[PDB]
Symmetry: C3
Subunit: 330 residues, 3 copies
């Protein structure tokens, strides 16, 4: 009747429409197993006082040569050369500057944490004096990295990203490079959301940009881009219709006030032996943008069990539907 | 009756048999937290014109020394030595070869993307002329990597793989090396699907092979093996019965026509200072096989809530069972 | 009645109390997408016969400079210098020691697997003789790493850990550094479970320790710490209440008898060119502690579908509740 039939049709609408055709309640799910390969192409040019006219290619600016699922691109740096294990004068810092040996306590760390103080106080320059430490010497100088960044050419760098996934449960496998697409295209390809959406080759600047940030800006102090690949698939539909979605997100905090060590930089070195048999190194403090490819899928496919489950839920629900509807009238 | 009792027994069979004892509908689930360590043992020998009789050990052929959860094995290479930052003649390519300086536009990239053109056109050889670029010099030569691959000895290399997992929800922990197994065995152990299934030490060639590929073949141009470890566990049963399953899959596309940059290769370098204080490097373009250990578990254990849920679903379902069965007769 | 009303109230208690307010059956779930950055600060000092008074900073002791989501800290090492590709005498091992060339079969591997035997037998020392091999020479000596470990200063090292997460389904994002916390605090901050629970800067020793292990002990042979971050969130509640939980677990087996290659060590090298144009390297076998940051969240939020589902389950269940209760009396 008005109470029974109406309510019945209503719950029908709820399940079929809402829980089923809408929310896919008739499906069983699986999540993604994933493998990512990246390849960066490009060259940066630098001109520098104390350096020269210089090329930086993929071996120079990718560090290390591979991280599984992510790559770090060198954008900026501070470079200290001809360091050797020795003693030298600490950089002036309130705690660094010293009048005499009383101020320098041997065996203790330093403000920077780049040396160990020999109690001896030594003169930094003709004007100053500061604690002597044992370290790689001379110490890196306290300075900000250059603005604009030395490796700015990197905005123009390109990264091929190959990603293959599989859903173990459903035995389905797919590649992020789709069947239609041909090799030559992929010689000349560059990803474009409008023109070339199926091109796996992305431009560094375009990723930053696409994330509503700017390469050059972000490139002085460094930072972290997430490149998110999403495989959501209804495996009832054509395999063809199962495709990756790319989104881009800057991961690190731009707020200088709520964090520590903003941007992205790390120290790493190059070691040489001067022919004497004596070791010397070059310390680089690099900044850049780490890119994290991040892949997450979910697939789903028709299954009796959950279907029937939901149905039973509906049937049990209508019982209460009649009461709730009845007492709802006047 | 014939309608009621029969249907009742039928749905009983469906739930108990199908949704429960079959499909495990009485269980609650958790997924794996995982840690992987790998250790490669072996030595490769090479003999080469322009090189010599040479050894390559783990420090030489694993690059870099560690990636979390995966390792790259060096199989092939192209090696350019005594490069220094300088200018030189580009390699002949349709765009490379030049008659005069008009053809070379200063400040622009090159076909390879290994240099920046100074507008000056310089003669490659007595016969040819091509654009001058600033780069690490001399340039790597355009050539294919050697066939058969230099590091073929790597087929015979061995990798210990230790994998420890935990299911946070169920508090259960396990190691991929099982309790029975003893240390000496693990001195001499090599994984065998027939004889030694519980041996964590796998042979590179055997992984490739087990994946229905061939090391040597795959080793010229490089590539990617997935080593898949699966922990599916019914935590109702003995902990003893919770074990890893190993499968092996080549991840990259063998089709040359549907992709870019087939196989696996990357560039990386060794930097030296000639005693003058002058820098020089050796560029290696390596090929090899990256191995991705990929671990995915699911554990499940009895829970009242889902059990009862399913039951209710059944009871609600039978109501419709009577109607559907009745109207199904004649 | 006594049968009907009582049972009704009982199942009500079961669902509302147990399946709902207790077990959160009214919620829908999502799991974590995660990004981790780590930064190690500190300096180690070493004094050694055959070495000197020496500093080791972050470039020296972090290897390689970055792994995505985990870092390896150098604690101990065995160091072999001025190796060059050449031939030399193998280390005495039952299989190593040889009386004459019959005992040395050319072209075959060795016990250590660091060389290839030229059939020639050569005298190790004035006293002994052993097989000649082609290798980097001289060979690393068979010895245990030093006790106590050279890099013990590392116990005192500190690691900033930044972790940003997002739940794609619920669009919620959060950082492991919380809004209240201010920069200066994070200059001086060190994580403390009692005093400073919201400090992202952890002390290596304190992590080991917190895991009921000891840095120094674990530091001779190396090993693996899991640093587990857990984001469990009810997204019904305040975003404020969504926070990370840190736990710490040693991942590797301390049992020497049930495994292979205990602790954590790997080989890696430094390559130099002696001015002749001749290559030489330094082989380091390092030990240390790899730290794996491991992040797993689950978020949940109210949803009609599962709520109603469970309800229906309840209603269907009570039907059986009446029978089970009735037949339960006398
Ligand atoms: C191998 O596969 C490629 C896959 O791209 C394919 O060539 C492409 O064919 C399609 C269909 O004709 C075209 O794609 C684009 O479609 C948009 C509309 O959505 C147009 O606005 C695009 O304009 C292009 O203009 C130029 C086309 O040459 C490009 O310089 C520019 O980047 C735009 O893409 C474009 O038409 C298009 O024709 C190409 N895509 C491109 C960029 O080449 C083809 O089937 C196969 N290639 C061959 C020749 O075997
Ligand atoms: C420590 O644990 C090891 C675990 O392997 C164990 O030694 C093993 O015992 C079992 C049971 O007797 C044996 O395993 C194998 O079983 C298959 C049948 O499924 C046989 O066909 C195998 O044939 C072997 O032949 C040789 C055995 O020495 C091997 O050269 C060869 O690789 C095959 O494995 C084999 O019998 C077997 O006896 C060993 N496994 C091996 C290979 O050693 C033992 O309990 C413990 N070790 C000790 C001595 O404490
Ligand atoms: C920016 O945020 C910081 C966040 O810590 C905050 O300063 C802190 O304020 C709280 C609240 O007064 C204090 O936290 C601690 O609370 C526990 C009790 O649970 C106390 O036992 C702690 O004792 C501290 O003693 C010293 C405090 O200076 C520390 O040396 C020691 O490590 C303990 O933390 C402590 O009171 C505390 O006052 C600080 N936390 C610390 C350690 O600084 C403040 O709101 C903001 N900072 C500023 C000044 O803007
Ligand atoms: C390296 O050791 C060699 C022998 O292999 C020795 O002749 C030479 O002196 C060493 N070079 C240096 C810098 O000590
Ligand atoms: C390195 O600097 C040292 C002082 O530490 C200096 O004496 C020497 O000239 C330098 N070596 C080179 C190659 O310039
Ligand atoms: C390196 O090559 C240069 C030319 O760029 C050459 O003059 C020099 O001999 C080489 N150095 C060595 C050690 O052979
Ligand atoms: Gd710009
Ligand atoms: Gd073969
Ligand atoms: Gd201690």
């Amino acid at each position: 009747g008005t109470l029974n039939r109406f309510t019945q049709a209503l719950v029908i609408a709820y399940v079929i429409g809402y829980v089923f055709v809408y929310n896919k309640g008739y499906q069983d799910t699986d999540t993604v197993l994933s493998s990512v390969t990246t390849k960066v192409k490009g060259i940066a040019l630098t001109k520098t006082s104390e350096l020269g006219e210089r090329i930086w290619d993929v071996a120079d600016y990718i560090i290390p040569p591979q991280e599984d699922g992510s790559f770090f691109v060198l954008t900026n740096m501070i470079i200290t050369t001809n360091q050797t294990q020795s003693k030298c004068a600490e950089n002036p810092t309130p705690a660094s500057t010293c009048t005499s040996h009383r101020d320098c306590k041997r065996g203790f760390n330093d403000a920077r944490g780049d040396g160990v103080r020999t109690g001896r106080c030594v003169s930094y320059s003709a004007s100053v004096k500061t604690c002597e430490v044992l370290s790689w010497c001379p110490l890196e100088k306290i300075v900000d990295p250059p603005n604009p960044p030395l490796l700015a050419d990197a905005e123009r760098f390109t990264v091929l990203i190959k990603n293959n996934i599989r859903y173990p449960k459903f035995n389905f496998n797919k590649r992020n490079i789709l069947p239609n697409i041909n090799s030559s295209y992929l010689t000349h390809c560059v990803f474009s959301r409008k023109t070339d959406p199926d091109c796996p080759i992305f431009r560094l600047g375009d990723i930053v940009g696409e994330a509503e940030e700017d390469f050059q800006i972000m490139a002085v102090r460094g930072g972290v881009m997430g490149v998110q690949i999403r495989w959501d698939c209804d495996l009832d539909m054509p395999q063809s219709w199962c495709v990756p979605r790319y989104t881009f997100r800057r991961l690190d905090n731009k707020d200088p006030d709520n964090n520590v060590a903003p941007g992205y930089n790390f120290r790493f070195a190059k070691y040489y032996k001067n022919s004497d048999g004596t070791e010397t190194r070059t310390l680089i403090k690099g900044y850049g943008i780490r890119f994290d490819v991040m892949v997450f899928g979910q697939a789903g496919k028709f299954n009796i069990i959950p279907t029937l489950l939901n149905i039973g839920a509906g049937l049990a629900l209508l019982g209460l539907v009649n009461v709730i509807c009845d007492w709802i009238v006047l």
